Amino acid sequence: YDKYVSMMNMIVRKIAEVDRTAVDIVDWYLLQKENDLGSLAEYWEERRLAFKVIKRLVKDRILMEIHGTRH
Amino acid sequence: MIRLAEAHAKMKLKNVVELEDVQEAVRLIRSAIKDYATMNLVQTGKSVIQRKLQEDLSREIMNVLKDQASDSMSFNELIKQINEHSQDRVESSDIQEALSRLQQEDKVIVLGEGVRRSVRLNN
């Protein structure tokens, strides 16, 4: 997944710096990604791996959550 | 193999080689191999050997990072889980060594005497 991981890393980096609430990234970068949607199955897969990735840098290391109210 | 077989056909006084006599020519090499039954350095040194080694290493480092809320992994806890998951026997010295490697590889970034903090692998 490492290559995909790399790409998603890129989309995430890009959307992050460019943006400078987790759902908003999911939605904006899936908004971005629908332009490249080659399949609705790919829509759901990219949604799946984004959800999983978010799940990963939240459940694991890379994140910061300032106050759980917002965080 | 070349030079050698050339001796073989040199014997028997052949100015040209049979494709035959190369058989035993190989065979003779196959002898130390047949003596090899009962390069290596790398082989041992790849995960499961050293690639295996450092791989698990980093793996764990990542883990205790994660479970540390990213805080540093301790020398101790490192050694502990690393002999703990026991199996392929990671000796704390070997541990020390590979650790040294990744850090020095900047595959890790850590420090202290009895304090091995964690890493940041930038490489």
From Swiss-Prot, chain A:
Subcellular location: Nucleus
Highest taxon above the source species: Eukaryota
TM stretches of this protein: none
Subunit structure: Component of the MCM2-7 complex. The complex forms a toroidal hexameric ring with the proposed subunit order MCM2-MCM6-MCM4-MCM7-MCM3-MCM5; loaded onto DNA, forms a head-head double hexamer. Interacts with MCM10.
Function: Acts as a component of the MCM2-7 complex (MCM complex) which is the putative replicative helicase essential for 'once per cell cycle' DNA replication initiation and elongation in eukaryotic cells. The active ATPase sites in the MCM2-7 ring are formed through the interaction surfaces of two neighboring subunits such that a critical structure of a conserved arginine finger motif is provided in trans relative to the ATP-binding site of the Walker A box of the adjacent subunit. The six ATPase active sites, however, are likely to contribute differentially to the complex helicase activity.
Miscellaneous notes: Present with 13400 molecules/cell in log phase SD medium. Early fractionation of eukaryotic MCM proteins yielded a variety of dimeric, trimeric and tetrameric complexes with unclear biological significance. Specifically a MCM467 subcomplex is shown to have in vitro helicase activity which is inhibited by the MCM2 subunit. The MCM2-7 hexamer is the proposed physiological active complex.
Family: Belongs to the MCM family.
Protein name: DNA replication licensing factor MCM6
Gene name as annotated: MCM6
Full protein segment contained here: 906 to 982 of 1017
Swiss-Prot record, chain B:
Coiled-coil portions: none
Residues passing through the membrane, by range: none
Cellular compartments annotated: Nucleus
Additional record remark: Present with 8800 molecules/cell in log phase SD medium. Early fractionation of eukaryotic MCM proteins yielded a variety of dimeric, trimeric and tetrameric complexes with unclear biological significance. Specifically a MCM467 subcomplex is shown to have in vitro helicase activity which is inhibited by the MCM2 subunit. The MCM2-7 hexamer is the proposed physiological active complex.
Oligomer status and interactors: Component of the MCM2-7 complex. The complex forms a toroidal hexameric ring with the proposed subunit order MCM2-MCM6-MCM4-MCM7-MCM3-MCM5; loaded onto DNA, forms a head-head double hexamer.
Membership in a protein family: Belongs to the MCM family.
Protein name: DNA replication licensing factor MCM4
Organism field: Saccharomyces cerevisiae (strain ATCC 204508 / S288c)
Covered range of the whole protein: 801 to 931 of 933
